[PDB]
Amino acid sequence: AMIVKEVYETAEKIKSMEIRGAGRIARAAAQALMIQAEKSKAKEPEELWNELKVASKILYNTRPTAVSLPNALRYVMHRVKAAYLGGADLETLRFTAINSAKEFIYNSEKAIERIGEIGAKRIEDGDIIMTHCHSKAAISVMKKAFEQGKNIKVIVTETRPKWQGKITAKELASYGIPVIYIVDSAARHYMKMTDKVVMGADSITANGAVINKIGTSLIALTAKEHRVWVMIAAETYKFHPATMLGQLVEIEMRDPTEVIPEEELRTWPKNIEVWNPAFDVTPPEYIDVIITERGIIPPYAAIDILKEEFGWALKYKEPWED
Amino acid sequence: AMIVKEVYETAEKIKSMEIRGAGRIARAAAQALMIQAEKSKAKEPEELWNELKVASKILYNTRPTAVSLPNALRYVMHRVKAAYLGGADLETLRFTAINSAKEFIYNSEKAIERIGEIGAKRIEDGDIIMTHCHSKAAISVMKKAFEQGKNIKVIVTETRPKWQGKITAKELASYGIPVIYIVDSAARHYMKMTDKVVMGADSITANGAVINKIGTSLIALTAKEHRVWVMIAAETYKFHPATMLGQLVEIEMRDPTEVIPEEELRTWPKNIEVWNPAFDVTPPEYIDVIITERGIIPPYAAIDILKEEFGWALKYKEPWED
Amino acid sequence: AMIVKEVYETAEKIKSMEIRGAGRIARAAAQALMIQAEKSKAKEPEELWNELKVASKILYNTRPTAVSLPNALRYVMHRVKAAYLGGADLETLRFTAINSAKEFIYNSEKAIERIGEIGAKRIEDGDIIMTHCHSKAAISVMKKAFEQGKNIKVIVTETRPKWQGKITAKELASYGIPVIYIVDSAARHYMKMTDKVVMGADSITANGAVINKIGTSLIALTAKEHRVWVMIAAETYKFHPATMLGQLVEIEMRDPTEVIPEEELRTWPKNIEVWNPAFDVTPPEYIDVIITERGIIPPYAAIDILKEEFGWALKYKEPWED
Amino acid sequence: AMIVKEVYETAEKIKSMEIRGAGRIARAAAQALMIQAEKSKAKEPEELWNELKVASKILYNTRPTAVSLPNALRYVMHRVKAAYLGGADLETLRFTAINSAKEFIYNSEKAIERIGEIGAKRIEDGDIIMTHCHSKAAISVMKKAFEQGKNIKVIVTETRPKWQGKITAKELASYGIPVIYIVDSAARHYMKMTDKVVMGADSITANGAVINKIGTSLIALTAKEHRVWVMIAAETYKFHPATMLGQLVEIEMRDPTEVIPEEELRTWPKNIEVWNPAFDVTPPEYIDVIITERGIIPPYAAIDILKEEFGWALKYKEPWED
Amino acid sequence: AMIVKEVYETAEKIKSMEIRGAGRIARAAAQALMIQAEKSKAKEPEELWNELKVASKILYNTRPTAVSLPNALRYVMHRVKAAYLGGADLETLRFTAINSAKEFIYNSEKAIERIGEIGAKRIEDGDIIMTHCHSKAAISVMKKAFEQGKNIKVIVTETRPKWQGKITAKELASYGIPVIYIVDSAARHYMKMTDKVVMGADSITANGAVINKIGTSLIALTAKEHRVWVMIAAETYKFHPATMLGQLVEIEMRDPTEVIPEEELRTWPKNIEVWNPAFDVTPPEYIDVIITERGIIPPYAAIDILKEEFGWALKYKEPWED
Amino acid sequence: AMIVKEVYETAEKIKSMEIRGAGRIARAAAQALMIQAEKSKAKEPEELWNELKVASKILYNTRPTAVSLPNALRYVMHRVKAAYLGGADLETLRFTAINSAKEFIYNSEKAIERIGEIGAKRIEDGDIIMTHCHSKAAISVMKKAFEQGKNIKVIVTETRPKWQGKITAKELASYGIPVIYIVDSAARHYMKMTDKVVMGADSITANGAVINKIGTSLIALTAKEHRVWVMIAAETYKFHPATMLGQLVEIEMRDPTEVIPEEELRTWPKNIEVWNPAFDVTPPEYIDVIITERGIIPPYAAIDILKEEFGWALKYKEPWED
Ligand SMILES: O=C(COP(=O)(O)O)[C@H](O)[C@H](O)COP(=O)(O)O
Ligand SMILES: O=C(COP(=O)(O)O)[C@H](O)[C@H](O)COP(=O)(O)O
Ligand SMILES: O=C(COP(=O)(O)O)[C@H](O)[C@H](O)COP(=O)(O)O
Ligand SMILES: O=C(COP(=O)(O)O)[C@H](O)[C@H](O)COP(=O)(O)O
Ligand SMILES: O=C(COP(=O)(O)O)[C@H](O)[C@H](O)COP(=O)(O)O
Ligand SMILES: O=C(COP(=O)(O)O)[C@H](O)[C@H](O)COP(=O)(O)O
Ligand SMILES: [Cl-]
Ligand SMILES: [Cl-]
Ligand SMILES: [K+]
Ligand SMILES: [K+]
Ligand SMILES: [K+]
Ligand SMILES: [K+]
Ligand SMILES: [K+]
Ligand SMILES: [K+]
């Protein structure tokens, strides 16, 4: 297949984390499919279809843990598959792909804005909020509550090894929100003064577990310990359909040099191994609510989001497979 | 008073953490008093006594949290005080100081070796041990168990912000112990595969609480969560006499530029504050045993170590005060 | 608008708690809209519509915490509103108000009887049951169990500050049920002998939390500590629609002189503040089941009752608004 | 009245536990109805209908606790009853009974197979799995994970008093799976080395509680203590519809001589009573997932399985009742 | 036999709770013995000895639960008994009684002062403290922290049925301390805002359990739930020696008319029983420290206080017994 | 050495468990050293010393887990050793062996009686008590309570694999105590009706952990879940000195054919391994008190019993070593 440059570059940027965060990765995948479709020099429906399948596979094979990425490719490719198999001609097939992409992208933006509005109602004047990593859905909540006049402060954890917390601290301070920045290890120490914990998600499973940046689960555990509300801000496309049929979520292991720079690491002895898991699993007993664009649910209702939105597709193969 | 150079330099090195770890800080303080005494050009007992009081105050005012430092100065200064007040002449007073210092220093070395031997009996062939920071008492335990032929591995957490875990990983690997190095945030994720947790202490309180490097308490919490043994390796001079009469232990707050380098931090906006607590408090319910040079105790027997060894001195003022 | 006397009187009696209990308040509110529609001297539909709107606002601004009140008002006014906007003449609009209110009242009564039949199946012969406040729904359960010939005893807590427990003790004893009356403080001490706890609700939230009379959450906490089943008897109109989209339930703060009578309180020093929250929040982890007129549910299924009964109205404004 | 000997023999064998296991019991009851219908010498539909009702009652009165049995009888009898009341003639009613019986049996076999395929995806290479009693649904899970090439080992508890664990041990070993066999008392002692607990169910209630062989609740309690996953493998026909309306599940008390043999027991004095409950109740907080043939659910979604499959029947009497 | 009216009046006042609080009751008993000895018209030592024994018995039979009372009687009577049996003459035995009484009283006053000084060091500036009942030992703590210039605020629970919280509220406010006054039921609701719980004790047992005013156990349970420190301020004479040898502490059941006044209660039907326990048992896992006049201890060191102070007396009968 | 027949026989009977129970084993071991000293035909002290050493080694290499055995051996042999090294002639050494052994036996018997008197004070009229295995110390408690006229019932668990519970059930019933006999698996199911749990010990460690018959820790876990008091009746010679200096208690693994009789086990597949741990470890958090002959202690005071009774011997070698 003739795959445009933009697919390869998007995929590279997803792998190296120049494009990061689960929502954004998903939109970048949709965007990459859109562009494959705009620029295809294919002449028959079958050549575009083959290109879109191949592009989808390229994009799916970047980072495994955030289900947002394949849910975006499915959103597009289910619709493209149905049009192709229904006898669509070339320009019809192209436009199904382009318009599906745009639609996912728009709904993603709108879901995040609505999660903001719903989640902000739970934030109260004077609240100290602790967060972790950098999540646009969680930030949407904190930004909105501040826009409503509530005087909040946010405790931002630095989020080793990639320092996502620096992104969050700078962004929240740019909206005028006072920030306290701490190392991850200090989360129990400051949990007494915290009123709420607001974090994002990469995948949410059928039984209510949340997969999110390495350390989330520790934060949640000590939050529960201290009876501090744990709120997870997550779009419907963070819910993981394959877990309904027993699939385990793969935890991505990333390069040890994100932890210890190559310069330093090559001087270390062989009998030291560096392990660098980028995500951990938080069980539902430590989460009080998930804030989606359709409402607040307990984590044990994740299964209902999945049955409503994604169950239908589980009988079929992935829409990009042969 | 005429204070020798070595007192000022020791104190500076303690403050900047070029001399670090609670045991070592204490020995460096004893050592500094020893040298003030060796080199004093005082002519009367009262001039040396005044110099030793002043030196003690200099040393006490470096870092507040590890009670090892004042317990060492007390060990020396109680003995010096009693000799001075008993009418000691100059050379007698000098030697009381020098010999007391040496004695603390020797007993410290021997206590750590014995903690090693006692703690190693609790480590079993095949054990995966998790640790935090860099503690010579904890390391003594792991080194000894490896010397006994037990095939162990150690999970070393990096210990932000000062990276003490790098010291530990390199030291344990130099003895031939296989090391797995992880960020602090990954401690819950790897707690399932961990058999034992072995950490040090800076201060242990009357009710059994352990004050140790920022993050210890999170590690302990998730250890308890997973029914993983939490063992604290601590010399008797880590027990904190003033807590028997209600004293709270001060948590040292260190410079924000240890978290975010000055180059980067000066570019950040004013409405971000960086908080850098160097220690946290682990309650006794999350500790299974303390390994001292006199045995294994439950954390609730800390009070007995204190009553035996230090209660006597609480009626009196600090031995270096006027 | 020409608001009839029974509306003002009902509103004063809800406010002063001469009419109290969440179900009874809701039925009284529907009865008041009923009497307004009956006696209105309106000539136009637009005039009666406007009277019912104003009556509704009066009734809604009485006590904030029990969502039964607005759910009753909505039940009548969604129906009145749809009639009005579909051109109903005067007598059609009138009958729609009167009939919808009678429907609400009749369904409320049947729901309570059915809650009793369902809940009584979980009560066993010889059971000691502890309750709190005065809940018609909880009493329905206990009364039905006793009529089945189960030999029960009920421990009734006094329920400060308003003494609702006196109502409960005399009601149960007048049905022939043996009663043990205790102070709220004694709930842990007698939890060892209790087999079941049965309490009502004022509001149940999307995440499964139960808002009920101050003290409820303490009793639930210690029931859970002791593995004593906590059952909340509640009608579907106790479920709180706005919590689906993030709203917090307002906790009513009633007058200090309910706690300390005015004649005593005026003599107390100024630096004493009396705080009188009329409700607390029991988290779903301390509740075993909610008994609704449609069946036994776990508390985390509250979101399903809400989705199916109330979710449709949330995109619209309140049916009594301009 | 003219009941074939296969109905009586099936009943005897259920009661004596020659036919045992909840799914197998349900298959054997459907089969017994099948045979009554095939061999009936009835000449009129009302007479066949009577035999099916009497045979249903005889099979229902065998063992109380596993709801699979009545759910099987209902599956056949709801269909038979609708055909009888719809005017079906003899051969039509006969066929309805035979074919409904056959479908239940075939659905049961397929459901156990699908549970295996779904549950096996949760099992990872190198897993130690603990199980209890003998459950074909739990075994299907382990058998499929092993066929996928996962090197698992299974800890099998003996399961007093009837020794069902001997069946499990010999069966898993015949498939190639290594087994560690222990007494029920040792389950906490080996919970440290276990990665997963996989058990079956007799009845699952509307609140998510699982009723299973005596001792299950203990294993789940200590598994929870240790953060070991508890997975319950259970077909939809193990869900108990009467619990939706408050019914308590009856715990079967079996003969004391299963505990102590008759010869020994008759020598014991009369102030010893032997108590032999065959099942216990595990609360939903100690269960991570239930694996049904429709997917993985949190136990709190048991109510959703009940609503969509069984709720409809609750307004009617039992299809075998007069 | 010739008992002075002050003994009888002291006893009446203890029984009616005109003299109340464990420490005050013990002081009043020592004082009553003092007065019997001062005013005795006995002419022989055996006759004074008899009066002291009879008066001890009368004071012992007033209120059972607070061990301070018998410990005060023992303090005086062990000394009196050793003087009588050592041959003391009249004036010698008289003086032994007077002076032992005086020492107990003076030691009690000093002990409460020292508890204040020790406990106040645990209180930090800005602390919200919750308390229960009226305890002079707990109040000494708050009063001293305020005198040190810590801006504290105290949540005082009303303490039904005798309203001891009104004493506490008015007393702390008279010292300048702001008070929030609430019903006992609201303790969980305000536990989120509380930094510390500070209560007293009637008896502390050999296993670390604290027996204190009804409701204490509830407050400690929810404090533990919230990670709020529970501190018990208690003199050494609140430790219960008979528990070392297995004795159960008797929980006083007081008149029902303290709960419901006589006038109302006589109108109630006979199938209502009012139960009025005046104390409950808080287990040691819910207590962080006991603050004695000898220092801070974990509750598990209660046995050490008992061993060193009281153990000696357990082989003897009560010093007032024949 | 000329070892008498009774030593070899006693050692075989400990090994085969014809002599079992930790206290009884200890008394049998002392009785065997006694008989060796009685019948020895030694001529020199050095010869008898050497016989007693060898006899001791034989007796110690029988069963490893109950420290009562070596503590008995030490009791006799510390004394024999000190006599020998202080020049005792033949008859003096002999008498020292015989007398020390008789002293151990007499003190063991008195300790058990006294444990009974102390423990029975914690048992109340109407109590349901659950026990496990067969512990003379626990039986002493129950038997004394029943002789005081407390109307108790005892739930006795069968205690697989060796059925020690049959011994317990018949012993208690022969004293007139009502007995309910159940399988170990049923302990959680009947924990709701139990008021107290009373069990023995084999070894108690420095950190407060109790090593007792397999299953003990499970019963303790669920007692704790249900707030049922767990009391361990144990003599001071059940406390384990070497744990003070870090030693782990060896858990005895007994023969697989205790679980599955040889005639059945030889027919089972090779990939089944039967594991038969005779003991487990109950952590101190699940124990309320230890009842020793010196009084009630919390489990965390085990270290005090050890320090005062046994600590002195730890710097020396075992008194039967070369
Ligand atoms: O764990 C991360 C980022 O992972 P990484 O940095 O590894 O992509 C974020 O919390 C989620 O992705 C959700 O973010 P959002 O709410 O922005 O979707
Ligand atoms: O918390 C630290 C180091 O603090 P820092 O790096 O701030 O000195 C170590 O665990 C203890 O000091 C004990 O170490 P040791 O066992 O070596 O005394
Ligand atoms: O909290 C209360 C009463 O509040 P108040 O007395 O302040 O109105 C009752 O438990 C519920 O309202 C339920 O009662 P019911 O089941 O009767 O609706
Ligand atoms: O409790 C038992 C057997 O009871 P019994 O031995 O008393 O029949 C099994 O775990 C379930 O019945 C599940 O079995 P399956 O998964 O085979 O249905
Ligand atoms: O329980 C009470 C009072 O009981 P009552 O009101 O029944 O006497 C107090 O908390 C303690 O007695 C401590 O008091 P203090 O610290 O004053 O000794
Ligand atoms: O664990 C057992 C017996 O082990 P076994 O039967 O394997 O010897 C008993 O509970 C203790 O030994 C205490 O018994 P006692 O209190 O009688 O010493
Ligand atoms: Cl709310
Ligand atoms: Cl051990
Ligand atoms: K907090
Ligand atoms: K582990
Ligand atoms: K109970
Ligand atoms: K495990
Ligand atoms: K708090
Ligand atoms: K119980």
Count the neighbouring beta carbons within 10 Å of the beta carbon of residue B317: 9
Give D274's contacts in chain F (Cβ within 8 Å): 180-182
Q: Which atom of ligand 2 is nearest to the CA of B233?
A: 16
A1-109+311-322 CATH choice from 3.20.20.10, 1.10.8.60, 1.20.120.420, 3.40.50.1010: 1.20.120.420
Structure tokens at B66: 């590890």
Tell me how the structure was determined.
X-ray
Residues E293 and E234: their CA atoms lie apart, in Å, by 8
Do B10 and B29 form a contact (C-beta atoms < 8 A)?
Answer: yes
B290 DSSP 8-state letter: E
D64 pocket-lining for ligand 4 (C-beta < 6 Å): no
Nearest to B48 by CA among B101, B5, B78, B89: B89
Q: Which atom of ligand 6 is nearest to the CA of F26?
A: 18
Resolution for this model in angstroms, one decimal place? 2.2
> B110-310 — its CATH code?
3.40.50.10470
**CB-CB under 8 Å, F304 with E304:** yes
D204 pocket-lining for ligand 4 (C-beta < 6 Å): no
Strand ranges of the sheet holding B128-131, from the earlier edge strand across to the other edge: A272-274, B179-182, B153-157, B128-131, B196-199, B229-233, B289-292, B295-297
Do D181 and D169 form a contact (C-beta atoms < 8 A)?
Answer: yes
Instruction: Please provide the DSSP assignment of E137-168 as one string.
Output: HHHHHHHHHHHTT---EEEEE--TTTTHHHHH
* Matching residue, tokens 């066949």: D48
**CB-CB under 8 Å, B227 with D192:** yes
3-state secondary structure of F232: strand
Give A192's contacts in chain E (Cβ within 8 Å): 227
Largest Cα separation within chain C, whole Å, is 64
Strand ranges of the sheet holding D289-292, from the earlier edge strand across to the other edge: D295-297, D289-292, D229-233, D196-199, D128-131, D153-157, D179-182, F272-274
Count the neighbouring beta carbons within 10 Å of the beta carbon of residue A20: 18
Structure tokens at B309: 């060894």
- Give the active site residue among F202, F255, F304, F322: F202
Which residues, 6+ apart, have CB-to-CB distance to D278 below 8 Å? D65, D213, D214, D251, D252, D253, D254
Give C226's contacts in chain F (Cβ within 8 Å): 226-227
C289 contact D CB<8A: yes
**Distance, C-alpha D208 to centroid of its chain:** 16
Nearest to D121 among A248, A300, A303 (CB): A248
Residues D115 and D22: their CA atoms lie apart, in Å, by 15
Between the alpha carbon of residue B248 and those of residues A226, B211, B244, B281, E121, the distances in Å are 21, 11, 10, 11, 7
**CB-CB under 8 Å, C300 with A118:** no
Between the alpha carbon of residue A96 and those of residues A5, A103, D82, the distances in Å are 21, 10, 48
Q: Which atom of ligand 4 is nearest to the CA of D162?
A: 6
Residue nearest to atom 15 of ligand 4 (CA): D135
Q: For an interface test with B, which of A154, A171, A183 has the most B Cβ atoms less than 10 Å from its Cβ? A: A183
Instruction: Please provide the DSSP assignment of D161-220 as one string.
Output: TTTHHHHHHHHHHHTT--EEEE-GGGTTTTTTT-SEEEE--SEE-TTS-EEEETTHHHHH
How far is ligand 5, taken at its centre, from the CA of residue E201, in Å? 6
**CB-CB under 8 Å, D160 with F183:** yes
Q: Which atom of ligand 1 is nearest to the CA of A200?
A: 10
Touching partners of E (3+ C-beta pairs < 8 Å): A, B, C, F
Q: Where do runs of H (alpha helix) occur along C175-215?
A: none
**CB-CB under 8 Å, A227 with E225:** yes
Instruction: Please provide the DSSP assignment of A112-173 as one string.
Output: HHHHHHHHHTT--TT-EEEE-S--HHHHHHHHHHHHTT---EEEEE--TTTTHHHHHHHHHH
**CB-CB under 8 Å, E248 with F296:** no
Q: Which residue of A has its CA nearest to E223?
A: A226
- What are the catalytic residues of D? 133, 202
Residues D210 and C147: their CA atoms lie apart, in Å, by 30
How far is ligand 8, taken at its centre, from the CA of residue D13, in Å? 48
How far is ligand 6, taken at its centre, from the CA of residue F215, in Å? 12
Count the neighbouring beta carbons within 10 Å of the beta carbon of residue D117: 17
B132 pocket-lining for ligand 2 (C-beta < 6 Å): no
- Give the active site residue among C133, C184, C195, C288: C133
B297 contact F CB<8A: yes
Count the neighbouring beta carbons within 10 Å of the beta carbon of residue D205: 28
3-state secondary structure of D126: coil
Q: Which of C14, C63, C132, C202 to mutate to test the pocket of ligand 3 (most atoms within 8 A of CB)?
A: C202
**CB-CB under 8 Å, D121 with A245:** yes
A41 contact E CB<8A: no
C233 phi, psi to nearest 5 deg: -90, 115
Residues F305 and A42: their CA atoms lie apart, in Å, by 87
**B238 marked ligand binding residue:** yes
Residues E143 and E173: their CA atoms lie apart, in Å, by 10
Between the alpha carbon of residue D59 and those of residues D9, D31, D133, D321, E40, the distances in Å are 10, 11, 23, 13, 88
Q: Which secondary-structure segment (H or E) carries E118?
A: helix E90-120
* Shortest CA gap A77–chain C (Å): 30
Do F189 and D214 form a contact (C-beta atoms < 8 A)?
Answer: yes
Q: Which of F135, F160, F163, F231 to mutate to test the pocket of ligand 6 (most atoms within 8 A of CB)?
A: F135
**CB-CB under 8 Å, A225 with B170:** no
- Alpha-carbon dihedral sign for residues C43, C44, C50, C55: positive
A59 pocket-lining for ligand 1 (C-beta < 6 Å): no
Give B304's contacts in chain E (Cβ within 8 Å): 301, 304
A165 pocket-lining for ligand 1 (C-beta < 6 Å): no
Q: What is the dihedral of CA C115, C117, C122, C125, to 10 degrees?
A: 140
**CB-CB under 8 Å, D225 with B226:** no
C189 contact F CB<8A: no
Q: Which residue of E has its CA nearest to B247?
A: E121
Chains B and D touch (3+ CB pairs under 8 A): yes
**B22 marked ligand binding residue:** yes
C217 pocket-lining for ligand 3 (C-beta < 6 Å): no
Structure tokens at A88: 């669509």
* Matching residue, tokens 């998903």: A26
Ligand nearest to the CA of E230: 13
**Distance, C-alpha E125 to centroid of its chain:** 28
**F-proximal residues of B, 102-161, CB under 8 Å:** 117-122, 124
β-pair partners for D277:
D253
| Residues forming CATH 1.20.120.420 domain(s) in chain B | 1-109+311-322
D21 pocket-lining for ligand 4 (C-beta < 6 Å): yes
Count the neighbouring beta carbons within 10 Å of the beta carbon of residue F6: 18
**CB-CB under 8 Å, B121 with F245:** yes
Ligand 14 is an ion; residues with CB less than 5 A from it: F 194, 228
| Residues forming CATH 3.40.50.10470 domain(s) in chain C | 110-310
A20 pocket-lining for ligand 1 (C-beta < 6 Å): yes
Do C122 and C196 form a contact (C-beta atoms < 8 A)?
Answer: yes
- What are the catalytic residues of E? 133, 202
Do B92 and B42 form a contact (C-beta atoms < 8 A)?
Answer: no
Do C68 and C82 form a contact (C-beta atoms < 8 A)?
Answer: no
- What are the catalytic residues of B? 133, 202
* Shortest CA gap C297–chain D (Å): 6
* Shortest CA gap A227–chain E (Å): 6
Do D35 and D5 form a contact (C-beta atoms < 8 A)?
Answer: no
Residues D212 and D202: their CA atoms lie apart, in Å, by 5
Nearest to F239 by CA among F314, F313, F304, F295: F304
Ligand nearest to the CA of C192: 11
Nearest to D155 by CA among E106, F275, C173: F275
Apex CA E221: angle with CA E220 and CA E225, to 5°? Answer: 115
